[PDB]
Design an enzyme around this catalytic site. Structure first.
Site: not given
Ligand SMILES: Nc1ncnc2c1ncn2[C@@H]1O[C@H](COP(=O)(O)OP(=O)(O)O)[C@@H](O)[C@H]1O
Ligand SMILES: [Mg+2]
Lengths: 161, 52, 54, 103
Positions: A4, A30-31
């Site tokens: 993704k 997210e990261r």
């Protein structure tokens, strides 16, 4: 881990810098190292310019190290930036959201404590209504367009979640 | 009491009113819709159709 | 003899090859003529519904 | 529009092999016109003025348009090719009239 983020970075590479209007990237749960990578990549690519006002991307970041309230409202912050760029500027905006599933997940995490009877798979009873009140703002009107690309995580590879 | 100011003392929103017609203009095209339309009429493509 | 008869029949039908070209032409112009009558009406109305849209 | 019906089964057998593509392509153009011709009225709906005379806040524009529109003579293209294809047929029949004679 199926691609993704790689696909959304490819879409940014192909469409965002080759665009005329503005772009908004809302990092939702997210990261943080991916956010740093994106910031530095946009700095080196001239898309984000730290010296003058020729920048073409606005970044909004509440990542996976944030409490559930921030991960639930950072999508709305990105929405609001893009909505200004659409309405008050008439521009053609690009809105990238990664990941939009963390909005629902953080809503569930907080709904646990808000004293609500849980629905299926332990999700909030107001899943579809909150998702609708958020997603109906990400839309093209006759005052401007918003080309929205949203990465959607799938829990346990179950597309019926 | 607007005959002096036609927009009932708008006092703003003209800055974005012209953006509305611009969005409306790009919806109808680009030509100046205040005059009559020009024309160029095309002709069909033909050949010789005899017994070769 | 009978094969020569049929060769008279086939050449009797010859004119169709020219009847198509006539038909295929005659309407081809009518198609352009008709469509030309839109490019005028579909545009003058466009410049009319503009001044009523704005 | 005085069209002429055509028996395609008769048209199919009276073509020589050296030009089948032309006669086949002529078939292709044929039906494409037939539907397209039938898929739109012979004349468009002449738009109203009364709805535009009064509901448009411009003076002169709603009339000179209708005046210039009525005073617009859209040119219909002349044939300039029907007699040229007929020039071949009369000669062709001449070349075929003798053949049915020699037969
Ligand atoms: N289009 C691709 N080409 C090559 N490798 C890929 C591609 N997409 C994914 N991968 C590989 O699969 C891994 C998953 O990358 P990622 O986009 O971060 O997955 P996700 O974001 O869904 O967790 C990557 O490390 C990469 O090695
Ligand atoms: Mg990812």
């Amino acid at each position: 881990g199926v691609g993704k983020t790689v696909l959304i970075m490819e879409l940014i590479n192909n469409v965002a810098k080759a665009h005329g209007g503005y772009s908004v990237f809302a990092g939702v749960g997210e990261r943080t190292r991916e956010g740093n990578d994106l910031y530095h990549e946009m700095i080196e690519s001239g898309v984000i310019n730290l010296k003058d006002a020729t920048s073409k991307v606005a970044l909004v970041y509440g990542q996976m190290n944030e409490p559930p309230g921030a991960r639930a409202r950072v999508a709305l912050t990105g929405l609001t930036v893009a909505e200004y760029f659409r309405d008050q500027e008439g521009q053609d905006v690009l809105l990238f959201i990664d990941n939009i599933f963390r909005f629902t997940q953080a809503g569930s995490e907080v709904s646990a404590l808000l004293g609500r009877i849980p629905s299926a798979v332990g999700y909030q009873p107001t899943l579809a209504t909150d998702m609708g009140t958020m997603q109906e703002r990400i839309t093209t009107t006759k005052k401007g367009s918003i080309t929205s690309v949203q990465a959607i995580y799938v829990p346990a590879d179950d597309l019926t979640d | 009491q607007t005959s002096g100011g036609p927009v009932d003392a708008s006092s703003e929103y003209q800055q974005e009113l012209e953006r509305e017609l611009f969005k409306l203009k790009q919806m109808f095209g680009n030509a100046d819709m205040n005059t009559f339309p020009t024309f160029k009429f095309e002709d069909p493509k033909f050949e010789v159709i005899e017994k070769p | 003899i009978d094969t020569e008869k049929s060769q008279q029949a086939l050449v009797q039908k010859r004119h169709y090859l020219f009847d198509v070209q006539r038909n295929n032409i005659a309407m081809a112009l009518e198609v352009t003529y008709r469509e030309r009558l839109y490019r005028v009406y579909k545009e003058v109305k466009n410049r009319l519904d503009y001044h009523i849209s704005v | 529009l005085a069209l002429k019906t055509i028996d395609w089964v008769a048209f199919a057998e009276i073509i020589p092999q050296n030009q089948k593509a032309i006669a086949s392509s002529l078939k292709s153009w044929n039906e494409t016109l037939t539907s397209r011709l039938a898929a739109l009225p012979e004349n468009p709906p002449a738009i109203d003025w009364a709805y535009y005379k009064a509901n448009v806040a411009k003076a002169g524009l709603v009339d000179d348009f209708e005046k210039k529109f009525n005073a617009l003579k859209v040119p219909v293209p002349e044939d300039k090719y029907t007699a040229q294809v007929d020039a071949e047929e009369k000669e062709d029949v001449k070349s075929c009239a003798e053949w049915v004679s020699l037969s």
